[model samples]
Every structure is written in structure tokens, then in C-alpha cells.
Target: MDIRPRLRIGQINLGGAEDATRELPSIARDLGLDIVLVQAQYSMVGFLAQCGAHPKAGVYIRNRVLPCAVLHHLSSTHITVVHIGGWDLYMVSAYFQYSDPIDPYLHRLGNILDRLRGARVVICADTNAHSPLWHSLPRHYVGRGQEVADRRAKMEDFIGARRLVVHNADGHLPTFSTANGESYVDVTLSTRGVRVSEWRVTNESSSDHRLIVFGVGGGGSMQIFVKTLTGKTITLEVEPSDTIENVKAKIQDKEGIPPDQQRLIFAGKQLEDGRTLSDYNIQKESTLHLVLR
Candidate 1:
């Protein structure tokens, strides 16, 4: 019942470039995934949003298109986060260590969440643990010193405590799969601010981990006209949520002029780098003046 502006988001693990399933960049284009949290993959080949001291996890925008700020690096080994400009939300890609105790990982994640209190958060993770909450473990089953079950329970509780709701729907399509078996270890979760619609898993790859895809939208897309100092008119596709700085980046993409050398003015006042277009009512049909230094 909602058309927030048609943005698709997904989480996928590339497994490795050694496989034939590494065409995710193309697949993401075909499916119109505006935002993606990738695991077991390096940040390369036109990442609009990229971070990490380590390459186990990273964020990517389709076609290097979205305007966003990378808030944290890949320093944590398990997670990386970016603040999508127009959506005004944090998107995280997580790849938890499967063999280690989940305790410390949860603690670090808790710390990250604490840093982002009261903000919209969308997280896609390769949880690698088993809990009855998202997975249909037998109702007769309870923890019997099983590491996976115990860890899953704790993970489930941590999510509960943090108020992060899982978006995986029923039929329980396993995120992790192999030739002979499959299990649901991948998860897509977000705070209540994020309406994660159309939740489903896709067999777009044979990389063992299927793509977990969903959608989120709202006042996040737009187009505008711009008048340059050279007396030429340029049309731009941008988001109302994009900051003035991001707008400059988009201009750079089209005009080959660096952002630092450009001054964007609206209604005779220069736009502030940290402010959003919606803040100044820069919507469709509204025009901006671009003055070059």
C-alpha cells in the first residue's frame, strides 16, 4: 500500500571472485537495487559508498549513484556502516565470524548501535547461527549445550534488546546453501523507521549464500534543473535527502568540475554542504545557480 519511491536493498556474500557467480553488480542493476550490503567481498570497481580497514564487508550503491557518507571504516572486522544522504538512515553490512564465540561480536555491535541511538538503521548480516526465532527449529527442540542454538538465542535476544526486527518472511528460504544442504544464516533487520517490504531470497548466484533482498522508499528521489554560470541549463537526477555536498559530487560527475571549485546557490543564497535539498525546498522544477570559483 506504499510507494516510497521504488528503492530495493539487498545483502549478499560474493563467496569469492573465483566462482562464476560474481556478476552481482550486473544483477543488482537488473533488479534496481539502490543499496546493497556485501560480505566476503572487497570494496572495488566503482563503489559509491566504501569503507573498511579490512575487506570482509562493505557497502555499495547501484551504479555509484546514491549520495551518502561513510560513517565508519572496515575497522571492526565484522561490520561497516554508511549514512545514506537522502534516506537519512544508516546502512550496515555485517559478516560475523562463524567459528568464534558470538559474545564479543554482539558487544561490538551493541556499541555501534549505541553510537547511532534514535537513528534509522538497516542491517544485513550473515549471522551464521541458529535460533528458533527466524528459523523453524523443531518446537520440541531447546538448547542442549548446542553452540549454534545457544549463540542463536543470544543473537536473537540482542536483536530484541536493540529493537531491531528481522525482515525475513516465512517459507524460510535458506540464505546459505550448498549442493546437498541449506540453512538460514543470513538476516535482514532494521529499526521500525525502515519499512522493509518484499522480503525474499534469490538464487541469482551459486555462491553458497543467496541474495536476501527487500525494499524501502519515501521522499528519497527527485530531479531538478540547474543553471550554470556559463548560461547553460543542466538537468540533474538527485534525491531530496541528498546534502548540498552530494549534489556537488553529482555535478562533478556531469560537468567534470570538482566540487571545491563550484558554488551552488538557491534563491540568491549559497547552499551549505551539510544541509539537505528538502531543507531548502529544492524539489522538482526548482532550479539552482552554479557559480564556479
Candidate 2:
């Protein structure tokens, strides 16, 4: 019998950070996932937070490294499905509110988004209300509900036109045990495209957050090369304003050509002035060519 690759979803507690690499082995096994994208403990003490660095860099780094590492491991291990958990709600929103509008974090995040575009990554996020940091604070006092909306907007801006699917996990569903300080489980889903499906199992000994599972289909080799090429080939419906270097970067990745070797040509004319792909009216269906010298 052949096993079709499916999504895996699990719940994760965002409170503390320790043994993220170790606590995950069983969850990976139970879900039979090829790659597991954890939200990572955003509130972990000092240097490591879920988002990445504090303020802007924090979210930026977490999004960048976690997915890259997970993808790398999955490739090495030959896993078929990849699961991604989203930034903790607070961390996601805080970047926009506190980071300088021109902060370098967005630039770093854009690179990660470029890497993820068209890649086989599925997002399962914590849609729950912010966890209580102290018993005296009201549950609603953690962060404004609109923070999710703001963070989503920022993500959209940094990711360009890539479609990022973030599932709504079990919210206020008693996934954590605040009263007993023991383990608890909350429900989560694995999603791809627009389809979000639930995972049936629960974590009994993990952190208060239940494991959320999501999977990517083993449809075909991810074709990282294909994504690179297609991104260059496809043209957006509207004109783009990003720098020419960005377009060059995409083209370089697709053809597996070093940056120093790139020379853009159009029609029969070679281009000397740097120009963005949008300047050429490139669309997703457009064909890209590599001219070897």
C-alpha cells in the first residue's frame, strides 16, 4: 500500500522555550510529517523569542530560521509533507507597532518570503487569545484583537504576492492547564491552499499548548528550481516598484547561476541598466530562458 502525503496539525504552548528540538521528536513521529514548522516559543527568555529578535528582528528571525531549518531537515530526512506554525499573535503584531517603519527586519523578512514563495510550506497558527502572563491581568488584556489583522497586513507586504495560508487553531478551548500547571491539549489543523483539516491525535505530556499538525502533499519534488524560474516567468497584474536587484536575485536562484554571471537580455537586445522583472511585463505563465556565455 502506498501512503499519500497529508497535512499534520498540533497545538503548541507559547509560554516557555526549552527542548523545542527534543520535545518535537514524538510529535513528528505521530503525525508522520516530513517537515514540522513550529511557532517556536516566542516568549523564551533572552536572545531567543518566537518572533526572532525583540521588536522587529525577533519576528523576522524566527520566521526566517525556523522554516529554513525545518525545510533543510525535511530534505535530508526525505519527508514528504511540511508543516509550519505561525508567529505568536503578539510577536506578529508587535513588529509593526514598535519597529521603525524603515527597520531592517522587513528587508530580512522579504528575503525569507522570497525563499518560501511557491515552496511546499503549510502554516498552522495560534489564533488563540494571548496567554495570561499573570493571574491578575484580564484575559483580554494581553493584546488587541486587531493585532492579528495588523500582523497579517505586514506579512502580506513582506511576502510580495505569495499566498500564505494560516489556519485558525482552537481558541479559548482549554488547551492549557493554568490551574494545575500540568499538561493539556488544544486542537489544531494542517492546511494547504484553502483546505484546512484537523488532526485527530492529542499531546498528553507536551506543554500546555496542544500540537497543531499540518502537511504538504508529496505531489512531486518541490522543485525549488521551478519556483525560482516560475517567479521570474510570471508577471503580476500590476506594475512593481521593488528594486532591480530583487528581480536579479530571483533569476539567479532559478537558473542556479551565480550573481556575477547574470546578464539580462530582452528581445535581441542586452540590458545594461538594472531593471526589475515587472519592467518586462513578466507573468507567472511567461517562459524564462538562460543564455549561457
Candidate 3:
């Protein structure tokens, strides 16, 4: 039950094949990242797919590019509905284009986000929009005139309507850098309640865009003891963000119990199928009695 309560997430725009093949893995390891969101990774997709064969492999890769974003799940941790602020969120990673018309992309992104509106979302993206609000200097702006202002306004409105807040803590530091100048184009957006800390920009890699790292705190997770009718006990770790069904699936896989035929009782109460582990207040070393249906 000494499990860590926080998770480390990272974002990087690889720029292309060289960084994907050489620096990506090294950077991931050095950061001890639980999840990584990659952008401009045109070639890393195939590399990750090939890695699916390794026996000790824990990485789960998803290409979310329309195509621009790549989401990397690097640990055994499952994605569950974790309460951040007052809303429950399913975290997501994304990437955006620099010069494309905003409406089309915004519409598409809006449609996608709409489906997840029932639950809050946390997104990190390499959105190419620049605004003084995010600390990007007007001189290093990528767009021009009223058009740029409109696009920025649209984004601000979207965040406002959705109750999202920019979680980029190092607003003063540029996220993208080059010989020309620096800009805070890469950004992180989350529902107002989530807590993010230790935001930083690192130049440890060769990519023009600096790596963004941050820690998310206040999410819930715990390890519980599952006692069986035969007087045997086993340990299982669960997160509030995980569905009760997911916990059943874990028990099925690890304890050889059929999920459909298994019944769980925690704190002397029968657990429901639809609730999350957090709903039950299932804390560290809490005991749950298990029975076969």
C-alpha cells in the first residue's frame, strides 16, 4: 500500500524519425514517465507497433493523429475516472497543426470532445496557436492580425464553456525554441479542479521543441486484500479512476475467477458492478471478501 499517489506525464514534439529512433526511449526512461504524449512522430508509430512483441513489454501505444498525436501508456496503471477539482476526468493526449484553418480543426476537436463531456477531460497538445494569455510573445507569433485574435478567442471561449483551465505552469518560459526565437505554443489544458505541478521545459533533447513534464496529484489509488471463502487472501491494487468492471476483470485474470460468476464484498457490503473503486472508499490494505457465484 506504499504505492505512489502521483503520476508523471510528458509531452514532446519529436520533429521526425531521428529523434523517434534515438532519443525517444532514452528520454522516456530518464523521466520515469508513466505516460507520454508525442507529436510530429510520423515514423515512431511503426517502431512502437513492432515493440508489441516483447515479453516484458508494458508500453501501450495509440496513434491519435488525425494524424498528429501519439499517446503512449508506459505502465500497468489503468485509466479510470479520477476526481480532479469536482469533475471526473478521462485523461487524453492530443496534437494540433500550426497554420491550418481553426474552424475545421476546432469543429472536429469539438465533436470529439463533446462525446466525453459527460466526464471531464485532461488534454496536452502541441497546439500551434499563440496568445499573450499563455505567455507567447506577440513578436514570435505564428499568425497575423484579427484572424489570429479570432482563433485565440475561439479557443478561449471553448475553454471557458468547458470549464477548462490552462495547466501550463511555466507560462513565462517558451515551450518551442529555435534560432529565430521562442514561443509558448505547446500547452496543457485540464478541467479546473485537477492539480498539476513541477511544470518544466527541458532542452535535454535535440528537438526544437523543449520537453514538457508535469506531475498530477490528488488522484486516487489503493491496494486491498481480497479474502476468499477458503480462508485464502490475495492482494490487489485498484485505482478510483478504474471501473468496478475493470477490477473484476483484473481479479479474473490474476485469481482465475470468472468475472461473471464472481461476487465481491467490501467493508461488509456487497460491491456493485457499475461503481468505481473510489466510490467504495476502498483504501490501502482494506479487506474484501470474495465468493463465486
Candidate 4:
């Protein structure tokens, strides 16, 4: 059996406060997280920056500001792109305001998605949009009726267009709660090819939102044996996510073969430049025959 690498990712909304600054790092460590995506992290930028220097740290800090409207001190969302185990994963931490119009938030999300195109992406956010597909309750309990319906429809359309899969647990559990009632507002979504497992909503009460945690599997390096027509064999260590073009470049660097003049064939088929090793289901120790064009 082929063993896949496992990576843990955690998402939490900080409730726009810095109260959890000290505990966040320890929590992430205990969870064995490779990346932590935080939303509503007002005044916690510096705190996160400091956590990047921890001795046992496994993740780096990253933040992005959307072009939409924001409070004086807080941005609409943040993103942290992490490099772990030879793969790059984009983590988008966001908060969708319950009071504001949803159109701008959706537009900004589009912009962010465009900027991170072609990368493995995970979006964790408190969307504040209610729909039976994701909500624990079958009916809407808060917000105006028409507005809630509109927002839910728009969000559903956006998720469909982007091909994002919502991570669902075995049973429905509310990620946010209050005296009014309990509803699932916080959600985790990822690209089609990414596999997410061990999804759970924790009871941690650092903020109003419960901690959302999941494990990402199947990121690892593959060793390829490239045999040229000239009878010379070269070995290359590559990430499964690396594109054929990237592998060609690596071959060019190591073997002094021009990328344009090199062709890679596996299982009697020529590999496409745009497709990744994982796309082809190329396993470790796989052999590829190289031809000089």
C-alpha cells in the first residue's frame, strides 16, 4: 500500500480580540497542525508574528487584506500560505459580516481566489450565511428572510463555480452558538483535489466560534528514475504536486538538457506540461523514459 503524508490544519475565529494570543500556539502544537487559519484576528498580527519564532513551530504567519470595506482596525479576511513537507498550501481565514451586504464579500472572495489560483487552497470562515446544506438547523432562525435567502443562494453559487467541497462531519454540529439559538455559521471549504479528513468542531471556548479542525492527507515527495535514450539514468526527487513543466526544468538544470528539447513518456503516453505528477497517478519509484526532441 502506498503511504500518504498527513498534514493537520486548524481554523478558529478569534472574535476580533487578542485574548487567545498566548494559548493559540500551544493549541496548534497539541493539535499537530502544519497550518493554522485564523479569522477575525484583530490586533493579533504582532502576536502571531512572535509565534513564528517558537522552537517547535511548524507553521509560518501570513495575512492579507481584502479590498472590501473594513473596520478601522480589522480587515475582512487574512490568508496564510504555508510551505510544509515540500508542498505549498494556501489557507484563507475570513469573516463575513452579518450586517453588511454580501455582494462585496463575495466579490472580494473572488479576487482572493484569483490571486491564489493553481495552488492547493483551504478557506475557513465564519460566513454567517444559513443554508440547509451546511447548517445544523433546517430552518433560518436569525437575519431577515429575503436577505438570508439571497446570501445563501449567492454563497452556494460561488462555491459551485469554484468547485469547493465543504468539509462535513459525520453529524451536524453548530460551530457558533448564542442565547438566541444554535446554528452552523463557521465552515471549511477546500479545492476538489484536496482530501480533508478528521473534521470536528471542538469545544474550545477561546472565542464565540468553536475551533474547526481537519487533517489534509496525500502530500509527499516522489522519486522518479529518468532513463534517457542515451542509456544514462538520472534520479529526481519531486513533490507529487509539482507540474510536469517544473520537472522538466529540474531535468534541464541537472542534465543540461533544454526543456524545449526534452520529452517525458510514461506508460507509453507523453506527459502534458500543465498536469501534475499526482494528476497522472505517478507513484514513487516510477520510471519515465526521456527522449531528446
Candidate 5:
């Protein structure tokens, strides 16, 4: 069986849409998802672990795949956290409102994170915040204001405090869209313990928002050695989706040679710019020859 050794996790904002509640689960199940996170789910699923006056944030755990414990924190109304047994990691389902700033949400996250220090945490959220930082591009509106700017400030600080990396890589489809336009609001951020792969979106979701489907804890990123003609070797960590041009820039920073001057060749083929390392099937410990022309 061509099995990939990784946990498949996906999230979709259903807006409590009737079709979404009916369609997305089987869509995800047939796709073999272990954890399915939900946002704005005013109705039922496997567990509505979080609630305030209403239970909105929800999560579904497919029992046949992995067994895990659910952890409910003070901010249950907008977040759901669960502890994975053998991995010693916690996955969180979080949400932010479009009308409200993330100040309250940040504090709630901080409170929970304070206890989760030195632990692995991966967060899947419909932040309702747009920025190129997470590659959540805006396609329709430009309604920027001071209130929103402050949210970005606090959000930056919160992510900086935890050193969380935005796992939504470049060139992703919009997470939320409508007949009018589209935007990428849903985001996945993680600590070093989680290196993201296959960041993608699925239209199978019958909601306004597409499904954020991605793989975690598996053969995603790789560390490969770069061999120079002088027999000097440099090591660099990269994702298979990383472009040849991007890796050249990293090499330039270390070797003091400009990216344009370096020619990357893997397995007798000259690696051209604008193509991904995966285009060559470059995997872990793959040695790439760096030639200066």
C-alpha cells in the first residue's frame, strides 16, 4: 500500500450550513482524515467541546485512526484542544470573529499557552485576519482601519512570543470565498514540532469556505547536503515544495555567492529556477551539487 506516514488533519468553516454538515464529513472520511476541525458550527458533530452561551467551536475525531483525549480550557467558546497520545502534542481548533479584534482571543490563547510552555502545539484557526505573512491574500475588499492594525500588532507579538511559524506556504487557494470574491482567512500555525506539508484547499466543502487540508508529522520537510566543487559541504533544511530559486538564496546567504551565480544540479539534471525540489523527487539526505558559473 502506498501509505504516507503522517497525520492528516483538515478544517472547514461550515457557518453551520446545512449542506456542509452533510457533505464535508464523508468527504474528509473518504480522504482518511483523523481530525476534522470546525468553525462557526452552531450545530452538532462528534464533540462540541467548546461553548459559551452557544456551542460554536467543534471538533471531530475519527476513532478508527487515532485515540486522543480532549482538553477543554477556559476559552471553550472559541477554541478546542486535544492531546494526541503517543505524540505528546496538542492540536487546537480556534476561531476569530470578523467584526471583533483578536485582543480577547489573544489573551485567551496566552492563558492556555502559559501552561503549554515547552510543549508542542498546532493551531488551526479561521482568524478572519488577512496578511501576506500567512499568505492569506485579500481579493475583494480593502477596508483597513486603526482597530484592525492593532489586532495585527498584538497578533504579531503573540506569535512572536511563542515563535510560532505560519505553516500556510506560498501559492495556496483561498480558504474562504463567495460568488462575489475570495480571501484566505483560515490559517495553520505551529511550533517547531510541526512541519507542515501539502497545504491545500478542497471545494468538496459545501460552505462559503473551502477546506484547509494539510499533512503533519511526516515526510514533509527534509534536510539535504549541498556539495561544492571544492569538496565543501553545507547543510540546509527545506520543504519539498521549496523552489530551487529559494534554496539558492539560502545558499547565497551562507556561501556569500549570489543566487544567480550558483547553478544547482541534482542527479545529473540541472535544477532550474522556479521549480520545486520535489519536481526532482529530492528527498532527505539528497546531495545537491552546487556549481558556480
Candidate 6:
């Protein structure tokens, strides 16, 4: 019997009336996903009755915000891949209300990010930062520099200045996806401790957002080489790769060997740096020995 690796895919729609929560599950189901994650942002209104007309007696007209309860539920759902809607839509307002410049919208966004610490998050915001307010206001009244730059600055500050990946809108591209139709920027999580394959661009048209697929897996395998060195059989995996360095670190960790005391020597000679497996033509499943002087 063959065991298959399961990948969880999450899709977040940024804008339009299209319901991503409804559409993504079917896509995930069709694509053999172990789990499908979906989230939708909508407006809500609440009526309040105030007693007396003091200075602050009237009902507070607050912006209906995305529920933290919904966010908490989404984080615990165990979804693996999170695909966010691009910037061209409502992502900016959904995450931050730009209407009130004085509001602490960024703080609220930070709280949401903290709740999503362990999950792989991707933000597909519109590449174009232009708002209609730009053209509506006079040039001099707009202040110094472009207004879009201000918005970008706020967004960068809100998300901790993480780099963005560019993605095309065809939804078929395999290599990379743009934030909006204009720019190619990916807002995925950290690339460390994971292998990121080259982006592929495809021509599928299920949505305006292009789909960027990544294969996250273990890349290299270890091989043990056993040989007779110094009149004794020593077994080890010898190579000048990072894996070899990691193995050395592991040995140091387990045996409590001081850095200066641990040295790797082989073939009656000092194996210099940059000595990779290819230097000795080490075949798969082959064994060799280490001569520790």
C-alpha cells in the first residue's frame, strides 16, 4: 500500500460578490485537498438605545469589523495552505479601515496576525494602490509625494514590512502570483526551513487571481558510509554539504563534544572545505569509513 502526503489548501477572496468560502471547498475537494480553509468579510449593523442625552449619550456609529471569533475558528481549523485575495479588492478595508486616518486600524490587524502565528498565511492584495480619492482631491491638498505611497507605507507597517510576491491573475500560473493585476508580490509566510520551488504561470480561469502552488517537503536524504580507518571500522556520512555540518552539530549536541575537539578527517588526509559527495563519486547505498586521528 502506498501512503500519500496530504496538503491543506486555504483560499481567501479579497473582493467581488463571489463567495470564496463556497467556491474554495469544491476546488479543494476536486483537487484532493485534505482540508479546505475559507473566510468571508461582511458588514454588520447593531442598533443601540441610549438613556439620557449627555455629552456622549447617542449610540456610537462604529465600523462593523471582522469578528475575532471567526478568526479564532479559522486558525484552529488546521488548514495548511492559505491563499488570500489579491489587493485589487477589499483586503485593505477588510483588514484596515482607511476611512478614518486617525483610527488604530493597524493595531487591530496586529491582533489578527498574532492569532494566526502558526498558520501559513498568504495575502493577495491589489497591486495597484490607487484610490478614487486620489483623483478627487486637488494636487496641492494631497500633501507631499503620492497618496498611494502613504497607503503602501501604512500597509507595510501593518504587516511588519514583509516582502510581497507578484502574481498574475490568470489563476493558472504555477511560478508566481501578483497581488493585483499590476504587480507581482506574494505575501506568504516565511521561506526559512522550507523549500520554495520556482514559480509557474498557468492560464486557468476559475478566478481573476492566479494560483501559486508550492511543493513543501523534505529535500535531501542521508547516507551512511562505513570503512576501515586506523585499523578500525568507522561508519559515517561524509560530505561537505550543510547536511554534513548539521550532522556534526547533532553529534556535538549528543556527545557534548567541544567545537575545537571535534574534527573530521578521512583518507589519511585532511578533507578540505568544499568537499562535496561528487568529489569522491559516492554512489547511493555505498559505505565508507572515517579516520579520526
Q: Candidate 4: TM-score?
A: 0.61
lDDT, candidate 4, 1-293, per-residue tens: 11123556777776766575446767876766656666665543454421222211112232222111112121233433333323545556666777787778777777777766776777776788876667556567345478887888888899999888898564756887677877787788988777687899887647777878887754334568888887877777678889989999978867778999989999899999999988888888899899998
Model 6 worst lDDT window (10 residues): 54-63
Query: lDDT for every model?
Result: 0.74, 0.36, 0.61, 0.67, 0.76, 0.33
Which scores greater on lDDT, model 1 or model 3? 1
lDDT of 3: 0.61
Worst 10 residues of 4 by lDDT: 65-74
lDDT (10s digit) by residue, model 1, range 1-293: 11123468878887755352347677787787777788877445455344545467777676464666777532355687878776457888888877778888778778878888887888888877766666745531354358766777888899989999888888857787777567777888888766667889998765788887887644335657778767776666577888999988877766777999989999889998999998998877689999889
Query: In model 1, which regions exceed 4 Å deviation?
Result: 1-4, 18-21, 42-53, 73-75, 139-145, 219-293
Candidate 4 regions off by >4 Å? Answer: 1-4, 42-45, 49-88, 141-144, 170-172, 218-293
TM-score of each: 0.68, 0.36, 0.59, 0.61, 0.69, 0.36
1-293 per-residue lDDT for model 2 (tens digits): 11332333333544444554345545556555433334434344343223323312121122233342223322211011233444211012112222234234445434444555554444333323232311112333334456533543454443334444434343323444556442222222212343444543345435555544443333322111112223433221212443345545555543455655665555445544366555765544343344445
TM-score of 3: 0.59
lDDT of 4: 0.67
**Candidate 5 residue lDDT tens string, 1-293:** 12334678888888876667667558766887877888887565444455566656667775444667677554487887777776457888888877876888888887777777776788898887767677754432235676656666677788888788888777767888887678777888887767677878887777898888887763235778899989988777678899999999878766678998899999999998989998999999899999999
Q: Which candidate is the best by TM-score?
A: 5
Model 5 Cα displacement at 210 (Å)? 1.0
What local lDDT does model 5 show for residue 57?
68
TM-score of 2: 0.36
- lDDT per residue (tens digit) for residues 1-293 in model 6: 11222122222322232442234434544544332222222112122111222111111111113111123232221121222222111111122222445125444444444554543334322222332221112322235365555765565554444333222233332222345333222222332232323334323224444333332222233344434344543333334354334544544453444434445544445444355555545555455443333
Candidate 3 lDDT, tens digit per residue, 45-95? Answer: 443321122211112232222122222332111111112234354555445
- Angstrom error at residue 93, model 3: 2.7
